[model samples]
Structure formats: C-alpha cells, structure tokens
Target: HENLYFQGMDVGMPFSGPVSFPLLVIEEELPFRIHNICSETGKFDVVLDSITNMPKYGLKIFAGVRIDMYSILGDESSGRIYTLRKGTLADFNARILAYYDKAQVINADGDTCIKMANEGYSALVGNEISIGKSFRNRMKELGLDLPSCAMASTRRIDEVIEAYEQGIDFIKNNHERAAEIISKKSGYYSEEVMKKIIGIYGHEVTKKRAELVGSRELYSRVVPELNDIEIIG
Candidate 1:
C-alpha cells in the first residue's frame, strides 16, 4: 500500500474555506494555501502559495499529494481533485481533533509560521509485493521475461538471484553505460546518484546488493510523486 494518493471532489468552482477541521484548510486563489497536521508528527506543516513559484498542482501535502485545486479551470466537468497514495480520510482526522483538544497557535502568520514543522513527508519504504511486481515488469522489457513473482516465490527468488547476477556482471563490465540506463529506470538522473547505485550493485553480486536494487526499484516505481522530473533516454 502507498502512503498518499489523490482525492477528487466535483465542485462548480474552486472551493476556498475551512473544511471540517480547524487547522485543515484549503484556499484556491492568490496566496493559495493548503496545510494540515502531519499524522506521524503532531506539528503542523503549512504550504503557502507565496513561497514556491510552482503552479497549483505543485502544492504538495505530506511531500507526495499534489493538490490540483483548479482542475475545473479549463473543463467544467472535470471538477477539483487531489491525490492520496494510501493515507485515508481517517488519517487526515487523526491529528485534527488532537489540535482542537490541545488548542495550539497554528495560524499562518509570521510568528505562528515559524512554529510549523520544517519537514513534511517522512521517507517510508513501499510494499514489497508491489515493488517486486514493478521490478520484474521492467526487467522483462530488458529481455528477461521472468515467469513467477521473484520476491514472493521462493523458487522465483532463486531465478532472480541468477538474473541479477547476470545484470551485475553487465554493470561491472559496462559501468558507465549501465549506470546511465539504470538511473533512467530509477528516475534519478545524475552521475552522483548513478555512482551510488552502481557502487552498490556493480561492486559484487551479494544479497546486500539485491536489497539495494530492490529498494531503488521500490523508490522509483512506487513513489510517483518523486518522478516529477522529465526522464530522457
């Protein structure tokens, strides 16, 4: 399961006002504002329009949920919508009532703004099954069409071990070229990132390298939010 996703609501126009809770608010005009209490951390994380030059869709919650508040701007039938990976409405309300009970100053003013948490989303690992499914699917395109689920099946794990060993050999032989392709698949386009990626798996064919690549695949495939940058071959 994912940590966040998009939520859609059909409103005639962009609705800007207090939702159900106090700290939870959404504004749809100049100085577009959207903020909520972090479920994991009790502190509030405010997202103001003035700070970032990005468009409405650029406004994010929990470092993942891209709030598309003005979806109806072009198509009236489309309506306003945002994303939520796996976090639910119940997750949203977890910290809301607590703020009401405790009664703290979370106003988006100069003094109150400084009190907001510096960080928003916490990096969490994704579902192992989903990660494996994505990894195998991508690997299939690279001329290795694996039949079974490599991560879940005991037999398939051995198959992947062999498969990755071959891939590792390729990385070692063609370190520069292989790292470029691997970085593209992982959505991290940089020599530094590639060095770390290659330095892990290309070094040796061990279980540790498998875990590193598995986590890399999970990060690239599962976290769609982080893939905002355009991928060029």
Candidate 2:
C-alpha cells in the first residue's frame, strides 16, 4: 500500500493524490521537466514528470519508480539530463501570505504569535507587536533589528514608501497635512497613530517602518519559482 502511493504514479498509470518532494535543495539539472501547474494547498516539491516522446529508458525507469521500489529513475531526457524544480515556498513566507489573506496584522505578542493559531489579537491598533520584548531578549544580544513584519489589506510597503517620499517633498509648504494624508490612507494606522506621523523620520525607509515590505516581494526573493502559485487553506 505504501509503495502504491509512493512516487506520483499509481500502478504505472495515474493517481489522483497530489505529488511533491523537496527537490529545490538539489542545485543541479535532472532528466525530467518539472511543471508547476496550479493547485489548492498541501505540496513541497520535487514533482518529476516525463515529457512526451520520452526515450524508452526515461519512461521505463520513471514508470518503474512509480510502482516499484527498486527501480532506477535515470536522468536521461531526450538527449540530456533534464532535471529541474519550478515551485514556491512551502514554509515561512507561506505563513506570512496566509496572514495577509486572513487580513491579520503582524503584531507580535509573547511566546505566542498574533494573526496565527497561537497568536491572538488582544492588543489594539495603537499597540503593536512587542518588538520591545524581542529586542530586549534575543535581538539586543545581536544588536540587530532583523527585518520583518507581514500586514493586512494595508497599503503595500512600496506604496507607503512612495507616499512618504512625496509627503516629504510637500511638507515644507503644506505643513502637517502631508503626514496626515499618509496616515489616513495607510489602512493599518489608527486615527491616534495617524495624528502622530509629523516630523518622524527624515527618510522614507526608517528603522521601524522599512521592514514592512509586502510578503509577495519577500516571497519572490526567497523562492522565485514559486512566485504567484495559487495557495489555499
């Protein structure tokens, strides 16, 4: 039974269950083309499928591995070793995007996380994730504010930055209205929080605000191939 559902094919024919493996760890060419078609959740992986007009061996060996445990799945494409992995994150970044989909704010709580199973939202919009605790405990030792935070249906970080840049440009003559406009449109800030944005950081990318780059951007940087793959709960 275990062998039956093992390597993507059932009875050397076809199987309905999703097939995947972590082939990204291997940075080398293979003999089969890995097509990353869309799917509903639950996958990692190195999904090797045979191309049409496969050589006898590519088909046989691949066919063998599907139904037989001792089969040698060779790296012999039509003429070359056609190994490849085209996919997306099956971990942390996926978690961030999950939060975005749920409209959760990235406010850190104690040991538990907010916007996640263990992380509940008891704090207010004015109250942010306790970066203070993180800094005092682990980060202070390293003396670094490691980049982080995934937010809601909020203005994307780039949009927010662009707004701040424009705001800085106009504020000399417009006074506080420039910052007020940024706060009002930025979505995640409370009215009280919005009122406090005057004369804060001189630059667009501040230590506190710069870390809010959208998860999709981070997702592209971390796992480019997996970019925009349909993700569902």
Query: Could you tell me the lDDT of residue 26 within candidate 2?
Result: 17
lDDT of 2 by residue, 63-169 (tens): 10110001001211112111112221113322332332343223332233322322322211111222112211222243322222211111122332233234344
Candidate 2: where are CA atoms >4 Å away?
1-164, 168-179, 186-188, 196-218, 221-233
- Candidate 1, which segments miss by more than 4 Å at Cα? 1-150, 154-158, 200-233
Q: What is the TM-score of each candidate against the true structure?
A: 0.23, 0.23
lDDT of 1 by residue, 8-28 (tens): 211111112101111111112
Q: List clashing residue pairs in candidate 1.
A: 4-84, 4-85, 4-86, 5-83, 5-84, 5-85, 6-82, 6-83, 6-84, 7-82
Estimate the TM-score for candidate 2: 0.23
Cα deviation at 196, candidate 1, in Å, is 5.8
